[PDB]
Design a protein around this ligand. Structure first.
Ligand SMILES: CSc1nn(C(N)=O)c(N)c1C(N)=O
Length: 281
């Protein structure tokens, strides 16, 4: 069937900048005819070419096209002028999850269990499609108007068929040891995020990047006594140095055992995005 007439920059009232990346700038714009708000990611063609990012941008547009799930940023359209590329993304009014971590300090058991499960569910879908986020962090986990998660940042993402290092704090050991990236690299990033939800801070913390990596490879981190145990036991089954021994991966017979964990005992996995999120303290 045909498509709706190609959108141009002139069809938008561009507002505040929402975020600034190395290669792009996300701006809040209002579609004039429909009065809808999108998060337009604006990338400069010369700059992408100069910095050899054409596969990065191509991959990003392609992955975002095959994603169709309530926990993921939707790509509504793409257009371009002489200089720039425009990507029409779904707009999350409540911003980063990190914002809410910094705000309330640390999450309670009900809240940690809710957003953790949402993240687990999102990762089950993504991986089900054979895609690795490769940079999953509280900075990439956005919060929409209705307080449900919306994962973004797919430039870094890898689509498997049968190279890159993410944010230091969430980097998996195999990336530092064998330069390797797998579905399980996202399951390490998840364990990190859960520890951040319960403790207020990520598990591997040090002066510079080099020191962080040393802790990661040495598995050097510790749980505060206050940490919920079932939450500790789950983090323990994810921050495993052997990648094939992480809860949620193919070698550990998939996502079933992960969802089956005692920390998700009271979770209705079935309709999470329809569920009313727990008030953040
Ligand atoms: C972190 S700013 C941002 N990035 N983004 C991407 N990359 O899709 C969005 N949809 C937003 C937003 N505020 O809605």
């Amino acid at each position: 069937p045909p498509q709706p007439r190609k959108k141009r920059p002139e069809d938008f009232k561009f507002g505040k900048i929402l975020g600034e990346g190395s290669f792009s700038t996300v701006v809040l714009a209002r579609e004039l005819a429909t009065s809808r708000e999108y998060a337009i990611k604006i990338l400069e063609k010369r700059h992408i070419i100069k910095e050899n990012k054409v596969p990065y941008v191509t991959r990003e547009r392609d992955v975002m096209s095959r994603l169709d799930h309530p926990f993921f940023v939707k790509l509504y359209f793409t257009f371009q002028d002489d200089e720039k590329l425009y990507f029409g993304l779904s707009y999350a009014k409540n911003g980063e999850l990190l914002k809410y971590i910094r705000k309330i300090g640390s999450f309670d058991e009900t809240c940690t269990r809710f957003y953790t499960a949402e993240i687990v569910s999102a990762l089950e879908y993504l991986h089900g499609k054979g895609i690795i986020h490769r940079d999953l962090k509280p900075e990439n986990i956005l919060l929409n108007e209705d307080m449900h998660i919306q994962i973004t940042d797919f430039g870094t993402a890898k689509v498997l068929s049968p190279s890159f290092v993410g944010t230091a704090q969430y980097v998996s050991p195999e990336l530092l040891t064998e330069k390797s990236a797998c579905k399980s690299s996202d399951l390490w990033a998840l364990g990190c995020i859960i520890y951040q939800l319960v403790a207020g801070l990520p598990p591997f913390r040090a002066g510079n990047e080099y020191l962080i990596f040393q802790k990661i490879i040495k598995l050097e981190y510790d749980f505060p006594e206050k940490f919920f145990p079932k939450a500790r036991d789950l983090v323990e089954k994810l921050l495993v140095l052997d990648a094939t021994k992480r809860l949620g991966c193919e070698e550990m017979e998939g996502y079933g055992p992960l969802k089956a964990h005692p920390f998700f005992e009271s979770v209705t996995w079935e309709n999470l995005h329809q569920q009313t999120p727990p008030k953040l303290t």
